Design a binder for this molecule. Sequence first.
Ligand SMILES: Cc1nccn1-c1cccnc1
Ligand SMILES: [Zn+2]
Length: 140
Amino acid sequence: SGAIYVGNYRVVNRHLATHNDWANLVWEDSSRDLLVSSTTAQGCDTIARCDCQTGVYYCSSRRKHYPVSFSKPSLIFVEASEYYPARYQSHLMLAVGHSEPGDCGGILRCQHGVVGIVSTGGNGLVGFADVRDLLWLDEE
Ligand SMILES: Cc1nccn1-c1cccnc1
Ligand SMILES: [Zn+2]
């Protein structure tokens, strides 16, 4: 589990979104595994605006933050997904690291702020749903 809290937005994995998230929907995309809902209180996070490929992510199944190198956002076939459709997610970034399903929502961050959230795992790889292209998160 985990979210990004930027302004009056809550960014979560679409497959973990709550009824309250869907009842307060701003934007959602199944292909990216992302959903954004409205908040009453302002959030503590800053979104990175950059093409960094190095950062640090939080892994709840280790209670640890790990430094990683990660690929640029792209289209990848996810094998045997079991919290959503199991085939071809977009705006995905991969790194070598540990990820189990409950790790979804952990933040990846660079020197510029939050890059994205854990969305996939398997075979010593971790995938992160990118948010750096969602410029509208910074305003309104
Ligand atoms: C973890 C992950 N997310 C998307 C693809 N993968 C991956 C790639 C290759 C081998 N195992 C997992
Ligand atoms: Zn950066």
